């Protein structure tokens, strides 16, 4: 595999969004991964509707602003036969009744692929597929105040993840500790968080914060 990958450079990645005060991170991770696999297929990058997932993918196991899973969103899109665009079904950060309209669908998928629980396999997936949906333990003050550099939190758990985000690549930079590898992660807390809304999460450090534990992508 390459030592460095950044799918934003290949046009796979929409700008950073902001979920507000709704527990819908899973919808943003999912749209992020489907935006990538749709681009891969069609060569067109279209922002997808998290509200569509929030309002409508309850039958697949999701619970709106109370939480969800990217794989359940991927299943909804297959079951539903479509997903509306962000422009047509904009984000309101509250759960409402489903207003999906197939005429405004701009995306589809035929299931999803779960990546084996290993950073080595996650790396191979990111290198060959595109942006990957992943779950992390973001429940630490250090994560809130992140500004730059490689994020490493010694109290981070590799099993109890609470936040869906999107790995758009990986790389390295020299550090004091010589723990130099990172996953490049798109968040959904707006541009003012982190590095323009991105975080470099420690890579090949014993599955730091569980980044490889629940990784998947939609099959388009
Ligand atoms: Na922000």
From Swiss-Prot:
Glycosylation sites: 108
Chain sites annotated for binding Zn(2+) 5: 137, 140
Annotated binding of Zn(2+) 1, by residue: 9
Disulfide bridges in this chain: 22-65, 56-98, 156-209
Record-listed Zn(2+) 6 binding positions: 160
Covered range of the whole protein: 114 to 333 of 333
Name of the protein this chain belongs to: Cathepsin L
Organism (species): Homo sapiens (Human)
Active site: 25, 163, 187
Residues at which Zn(2+) 3 binds: 71, 114
Residues that bind Zn(2+) 7: 162
Prodomain positions: 176-178
Positions of Zn(2+) 2 binding: 50, 86
Top-rank taxon: Eukaryota
Residue numbers binding Zn(2+) 4: 92, 96
